[PDB]
Design a protein around this motif. Structure first.
Motif, PDB file in Angstrom:
ATOM      1  N   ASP A  96      38.603 -12.579  34.484  1.00 35.76           N
ATOM      2  CA  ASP A  96      37.680 -11.486  34.174  1.00 35.76           C
ATOM      3  C   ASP A  96      36.787 -11.831  32.975  1.00 35.76           C
ATOM      4  O   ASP A  96      35.588 -11.561  32.989  1.00 35.76           O
ATOM      5  N   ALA A  97      37.371 -12.442  31.940  1.00 40.52           N
ATOM      6  CA  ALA A  97      36.637 -12.790  30.721  1.00 40.52           C
ATOM      7  C   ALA A  97      35.641 -13.898  30.992  1.00 40.52           C
ATOM      8  O   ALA A  97      34.554 -13.938  30.406  1.00 40.52           O
ATOM      9  N   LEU A  98      36.046 -14.826  31.854  1.00 40.43           N
ATOM     10  CA  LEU A  98      35.176 -15.911  32.261  1.00 40.43           C
ATOM     11  C   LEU A  98      34.029 -15.347  33.105  1.00 40.43           C
ATOM     12  O   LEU A  98      32.874 -15.740  32.921  1.00 40.43           O
ATOM     13  N   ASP A  99      34.334 -14.409  34.003  1.00 39.28           N
ATOM     14  CA  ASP A  99      33.280 -13.754  34.788  1.00 39.28           C
ATOM     15  C   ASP A  99      32.241 -13.127  33.863  1.00 39.28           C
ATOM     16  O   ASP A  99      31.030 -13.214  34.117  1.00 39.28           O
ATOM     17  N   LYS A 100      32.717 -12.498  32.788  1.00 40.42           N
ATOM     18  CA  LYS A 100      31.843 -11.752  31.884  1.00 40.42           C
ATOM     19  C   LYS A 100      30.876 -12.645  31.112  1.00 40.42           C
ATOM     20  O   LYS A 100      29.684 -12.344  31.029  1.00 40.42           O
ATOM     21  N   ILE A 101      31.373 -13.740  30.539  1.00 38.38           N
ATOM     22  CA  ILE A 101      30.479 -14.638  29.802  1.00 38.38           C
ATOM     23  C   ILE A 101      29.517 -15.312  30.782  1.00 38.38           C
ATOM     24  O   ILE A 101      28.336 -15.511  30.471  1.00 38.38           O
ATOM     25  N   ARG A 102      30.007 -15.631  31.977  1.00 39.22           N
ATOM     26  CA  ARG A 102      29.150 -16.258  32.978  1.00 39.22           C
ATOM     27  C   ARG A 102      27.997 -15.322  33.346  1.00 39.22           C
ATOM     28  O   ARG A 102      26.838 -15.737  33.344  1.00 39.22           O
ATOM     29  N   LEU A 138      47.919 -12.454  33.062  1.00 35.89           N
ATOM     30  CA  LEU A 138      47.149 -13.106  31.998  1.00 35.89           C
ATOM     31  C   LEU A 138      46.032 -13.972  32.576  1.00 35.89           C
ATOM     32  O   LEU A 138      44.921 -13.996  32.041  1.00 35.89           O
ATOM     33  N   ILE A 139      46.322 -14.678  33.668  1.00 36.72           N
ATOM     34  CA  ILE A 139      45.305 -15.509  34.318  1.00 36.72           C
ATOM     35  C   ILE A 139      44.190 -14.629  34.881  1.00 36.72           C
ATOM     36  O   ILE A 139      43.009 -14.969  34.805  1.00 36.72           O
ATOM     37  N   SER A 140      44.572 -13.476  35.421  1.00 38.34           N
ATOM     38  CA  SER A 140      43.602 -12.520  35.926  1.00 38.34           C
ATOM     39  C   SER A 140      42.713 -12.024  34.801  1.00 38.34           C
ATOM     40  O   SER A 140      41.502 -11.931  34.976  1.00 38.34           O
TER      41      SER A 140
END
Ligand code: JR9
Length: 209
Positions: free
Chosen positions: A39-45, A33-35
């Motif tokens: 990934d989701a944080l990478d995407k918005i960034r 889940l943290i992974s």
């Protein structure tokens, strides 16, 4: 207004396997889940580099882990890209179907459940420890939704009326009665250190009382 949807057969089968198989190394759910959050944080960034207005819904990029012993829930919160209604209902299913097929096959090239994340369906490892999973999510330019499933072949999606999140995803794990160890601070710390030491975003483990 609550809509109820059937899982495709492949994903229903994967969820059943995860629920019914004897496998003691359950702690890997948290790494997965943290992974996903990372990934989701990478995407918005990444998206914010070309359109900075995408961070108007929140500039902070982080992951919070929130245990609640009274509710018997462990919640993984991120301020990542979030998911649209189309993601929840259509897109996830499309991606997850192929990933499940590969994972099932790999399990017969002798692989073990801990490799689930390599097939893009690590989310479902939540069912190693949770009897029900509720996902609250908000993507830019769509509404806040609550997805929920106790497996059994169906899930629900509704517009969420709870506290507005700005942007991101909350995965709420309603823990099985014999999996309450994952509400304990030192147990969660142990797992994060072991499996998620190098995630490139602040992980804050909330404490209780
Ligand atoms: N914390 C998250 N943030 C954003 C997207 N996420 C996904 N989805 C990636 C994806 C989207 C659209 C098509 C394919 C992949 C998952 C992983 C995930 C989350 C879920 C789920 C299944 C899965 Br895989 O059912 C309910 O919530 N976790 C997150």
């Amino acid at each position: 207004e609550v809509e109820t949807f059937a899982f495709q057969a492949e994903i229903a089968q994967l969820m059943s396997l995860i629920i019914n198989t004897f496998y003691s190394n359950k702690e890997i759910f948290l790494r997965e889940l943290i992974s996903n959050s990372s990934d989701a944080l990478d995407k918005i960034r990444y998206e914010s580099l070309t359109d900075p207005s995408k961070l108007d819904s929140g500039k902070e990029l982080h992951i919070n882990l929130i245990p609640n012993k009274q509710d018997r829930t462990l919640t993984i919160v991120d301020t990542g890209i979030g998911m649209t209604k189309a993601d929840l209902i259509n897109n996830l299913g499309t991606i997850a179907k192929s990933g499940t097929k590969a994972f099932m096959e790999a399990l017969q090239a002798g692989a073990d459940i801990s490799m689930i994340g390599q097939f893009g369906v690590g989310f479902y490892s939540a069912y190693l420890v949770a009897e029900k999973v509720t996902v609250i999510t908000k993507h830019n330019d769509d509404e806040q939704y609550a997805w929920e499933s106790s497996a059994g072949g169906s899930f629900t999606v509704r517009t969420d009326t709870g506290e507005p999140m700005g942007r991101g995803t909350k995965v709420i794990l309603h823990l099985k009665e014999d999996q309450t160890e994952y509400l304990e601070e030192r147990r969660i710390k142990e797992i994060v250190k072991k499996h998620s030491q190098f995630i490139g975003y602040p992980i804050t483990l909330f404490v209780e009382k």
